[PDB]
Amino acid sequence: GSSGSSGFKVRVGEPGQAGNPALVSAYGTGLEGGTTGIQSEFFINTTRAGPGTLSVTIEGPSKVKMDCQETPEGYKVMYTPMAPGNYLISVKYGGPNHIVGSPFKAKVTGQRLVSPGSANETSSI
Numbered sequence: 001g002s003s004g005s006s007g008f009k010v011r012v013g014e015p016g017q018a019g020n021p022a023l024v025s026a027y028g029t030g031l032e033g034g035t036t037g038i039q040s041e042f043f044i045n046t047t048r049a050g051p052g053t054l055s056v057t058i059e060g061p062s063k064v065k066m067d068c069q070e071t072p073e074g075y076k077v078m079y080t081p082m083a084p085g086n087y088l089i090s091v092k093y094g095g096p097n098h099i100v101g102s103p104f105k106a107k108v109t110g111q112r113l114v115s116p117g118s119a120n121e122t123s124s125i
Contacts, residue, residue, distance in 0.1 A: 023048040024099040026091060030079065034087060034108020039080040044091075046074035052094055060087035060108075084108045 028042025046054065054075055058066055062083035069076045081087065089104040 017050060019052065019094045020049055021093045021095070021097045022100045024054075024091065024093050026099070026101060026104070030077070031089075031104055031106060034081055034084070034106050036081050036084055036108055036110040037113050039078055041076060041078045043071075043076065044074040046093075049093060055090075055092040057090045057092075058087065059090075061085040081108050083112045084110060 025045035026042060030040030030042045044054070056068070056077055058064055058079055062081065062085065064079045064081050067078040085108055087106050087108055089106065091099045091102045093099055
């Protein structure tokens with residue numbers, strides 16, 4: 001009996017790492033939809049791109065408390081909407097060039113929440 005051999009000899013013809021905004025990926029449960037009253041979060045794949053700087057902006061008819069934490073995988077973003085409507089999430093990296101998939105157009109449903117408030121402060125003027 002006998003057999004043959006098979007290997008692979010190739011040289012690195014690439015720089016390896018290079019400012020690539022496209023490589024940047026985003027996924028989670030917040031992008032799935034807009035849940036008024038629930039806190040959603042999504043991970044930002046920045047391992048292939050690099051430790052480079054990043055930016056995250058959210059628009060809409062009703063502002064939202066945006067949060068950002070330092071993670072070993074990239075950057076975590078948590079936002080909880082209070083009012084329904086059309087929201088937009090921009091993701092920039094390296095420069096003004098946006099990443100693949102963006103902008104993100106998520107639709108938020110479920111009438112606003114109910115809570116005792118709407119109190120006007122004194123000396124409004």
